[PDB]
Copies of this chain bind each other. A is one copy, B any other.
Amino acid sequence: SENSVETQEITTFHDVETPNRIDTPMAQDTSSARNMDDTHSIIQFLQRPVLIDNIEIIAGTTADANKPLSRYVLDQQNSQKYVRSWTLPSTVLRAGGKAQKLANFKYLRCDVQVKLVLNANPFVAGRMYLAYSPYDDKVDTARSVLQTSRAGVTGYPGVELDFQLDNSVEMTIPYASFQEAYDLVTGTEDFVQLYLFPITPVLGPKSESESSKVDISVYMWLSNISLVIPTYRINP
């Protein structure tokens, strides 16, 4: 009669009395959408793998995709040559429609998974290396992966990427930032910044009209997430 303080998700009210609320006579169950699928939570929804990139290699090669790793890097013009650059988590959040499903939240504590499905013919050899380097375009110039030697590139954490032995890799890129719980509104996140390096050049028969392809693909999804503070904004 005096105490009407009820609680919604994140919302509380303050009335004089309980305002004479009427409702359903009996809450009988109806159409069977509950019996067709269980409800997917928002921590369950940010664990779906997405098709991000589709990298094709031909050897070849006129392009930069088969320049091998330099044994020495003597100057910043002749930096280390790579394939692609994924600037996590700003790539994994925008793709797959995730950012239009974690809107109206503020802080995030994620761990990015990376999987490489690989599919090449038996008549082609080679080897790559999938290194990640946190703050790789924030730290001073000499400390980045793109300026060190071949022994220094491979010494970074990662996994071997041989063709005939590995058709799938599982790498767990950790929560690797100094700030507690990544900001989203006015976001400049870009903490861990991934790379893909070829160690040996891709090898095939030197006669052409043969089409020695590689066709890498990249899957990423989050893990061990905690999504906490509600807001009204978001970056587009």
* A residues at B contact (CB < 8 Å): 4, 8-11, 13, 15-24, 27, 30-34, 36-37, 39-45, 47-49, 97, 100-101, 103-104, 107-109, 111, 115-117, 159-160, 165-172, 174-175, 177, 179-181, 221, 224-230
A49 and B8: CB pair below 8 A? yes
6 contacts between A and B (CB under 8 A): A11-B48, A13-B117, A13-B168, A22-B171, A22-B172, A33-B226
B11 and A159: CB pair below 8 A? no
Instruction: Report the nearest B residue to A38, measured CB to CB.
Output: B228
Q: Is the interface of A mostly helix, strand, loop or mixed?
A: loop
A167 and B45: CB pair below 8 A? no
CA distance A117 to B4 in the complex (A): 13
A21 and B226: CB pair below 8 A? no
A8 and B181: CB pair below 8 A? no
A42 contacts which chain B residues (CB < 8 A)? 39-42, 45
B39 and A175: CB pair below 8 A? no
A47 contacts which chain B residues (CB < 8 A)? 8-9
A225 contacts which chain B residues (CB < 8 A)? 39
Choose from B27, B37, B39 the contact partner of A43 (Cβ within 8 Å): B39
